[PDB]
Amino acid sequence: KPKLLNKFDKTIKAELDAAEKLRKRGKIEEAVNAFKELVRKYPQSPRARYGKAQCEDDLAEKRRSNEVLRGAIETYQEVASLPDVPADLLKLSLKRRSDRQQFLGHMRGSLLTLQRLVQLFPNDTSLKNDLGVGYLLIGDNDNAKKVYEEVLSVTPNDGFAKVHYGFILKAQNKIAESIPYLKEGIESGDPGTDDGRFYFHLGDAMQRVGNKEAYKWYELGHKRGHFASVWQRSLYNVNGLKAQPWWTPKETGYTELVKSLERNWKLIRDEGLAVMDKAKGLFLPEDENLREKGDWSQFTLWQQGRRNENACKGAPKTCTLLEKFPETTGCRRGQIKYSIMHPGTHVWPHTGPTNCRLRMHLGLVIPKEGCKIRCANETKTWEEGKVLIFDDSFEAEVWQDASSFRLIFIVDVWHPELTPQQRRSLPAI
Amino acid sequence: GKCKDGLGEYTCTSLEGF
């Protein structure tokens, strides 16, 4: 299908094929030197340069080397610099370049590449969609929004642009407006729309507006393999881990940590109240659009398995106590934090990002009435000095209708069935 | 932005190559 040979490259097709056959047979190192020889002999050949890049790309995979991949990324660029590069090959080379830049975390580099692609191919809608993904990946939702608004002005029924536009709207708390874009986008079945993120946020958006069809989309999300169940909708998972909303200390095996939290709960409370009284600013408002209403702030001691030294100056004895429990201080997919919630607060139904952690709540200051937490089909209350344990990859909902503040201590632990190797290898969240 | 209590970011993990 693709036309990759310009006029000169057609005259050396026998040599180009021989080198490419070496690559397709898995003789990567022989293919590198073969294409390198062709680049030496024919330094302007775009197909030879692309062959070199692809071989370097394969060599990077074989060696699992970022340095080798950086070489490939530059060679993909060289292809586009050569004279008389066929359009198909130019597009293939810069698209792989961008993709590999994203793989290495060179998001700004990928963005420049994607911008160049859209400039070279102004009518390729899929490339504009890719540019929007580049913006999303660096957290630039405003520019991502403009990209998809441009796509939809020309191709209003582009499903990929709809789901991503809906995703952006919901992230901006434009809940009602996001529902038709997310729904119509998924229903389009266009490549890239069968993605758990869009089922996740469509159902959540619907729950927020009182649309009872929310769970028909969680069920379909479950049927298509995006959710372990309609209740447990995390998207960064290790399959097979025991899945239940509520855990006992003994079921977790972390009984020593629970004992230490409950035996020493008053010193944890007291350092939290001291920060409340003398270092309020260490409590930061919840910033994930999870509240319908109310006031909810958190004072974080560990995140992504990293101690916040300055925060621990505000709770030094608590940080010292917890240092003995790497099952939580080393949980790179959880946090250790105080959480204050005030009356008039309602947290929408939601799930966390991963099934790789379990969440402990230690009650510190609990009004006698008005505070409760639901996980899956079961609602519970906190007790001062007592630990609750739940899996927040299951849907949770929270209410605070007391007449004074509610303070808890949150301690995330690795899921107990995760191996030591998994605990070291899983990317942080 | 980080996914701490929810799942609101386009991606919750960082990209660091191999």
* Whole-number Cα distances in Å, A97 to A50, A56, A118, A140, A330: 11, 12, 14, 21, 35
Per-residue HEC secondary structure of chain A comes to CCCCCCHHHHHCHHHHHHHHHHHHCCCHHHHHHHHHHHHHHCCCCHHHHHHHHHHHHHHHHHHCCHHHHHHHHHHHHHHHHCCCCCHHHHHHHHHHHHHHHHHHCCHHHHHHHHHHHHHHCCCCHHHHHHHHHHHHHHCCHHHHHHHHHHHHHHCCCCHHHHHHHHHHHHHCCCHHHHHHHHHHHHHHCCCCCCCHHHHHHHHHHHHHHCCCCHHHHHHHHHHCCCCCCCCECCCECCCCCCCCCEECHHHHCCHHHHHHHHHCHHHHHHHHHHHHHHCHHHCEECCCCCEEECCEEEEEEEECCEECHHHHHCCHHHHHHHCCCHHHHCCCCCEEEEEEECCCEEEEEECCCECCEEEEEEEEECCCCCEEEEECCEEECCCECCEEEECCCECEEEEECCCCCEEEEEEEEECCCCCHHHHHHCCCC
**Domain coordinates in residue numbering, chain A:** 7-224, 246-425
Q: Which two tokens stand for residue A296?
A: 């909810």
- A188 - beta bridge partners? none
Q: Do B10 and A136 touch (CB under 8 A)?
A: yes
Task: Please state how this structure was obtained.
Answer: X-ray
Q: Which of B6, B11, B13 sits opposite A350 (nearest CB)?
A: B6
Same fold across A7-224 and A246-425 = no
Q: Which of B8, B13, B17 sits opposite A171 (nearest CB)?
A: B8
* Chain B contact for A288 (CB, 8 A cutoff): yes
Q: Do A288 and B10 touch (CB under 8 A)?
A: no
CATH of domain A7-224: 1.25.40.10
CATH architecture, domain A246-425: Sandwich (2.60)
Contact indicator for A396, A390 with CB cutoff of 8 Å:
yes
Contact list in B for residue A289 (CB cut-off 8 A) is 6, 8
Contact list in A for residue B9 (CB cut-off 8 A) is 139
Contact list in B for residue A290 (CB cut-off 8 A) is 5-6
Give resolution, Å, one decimal: 1.9
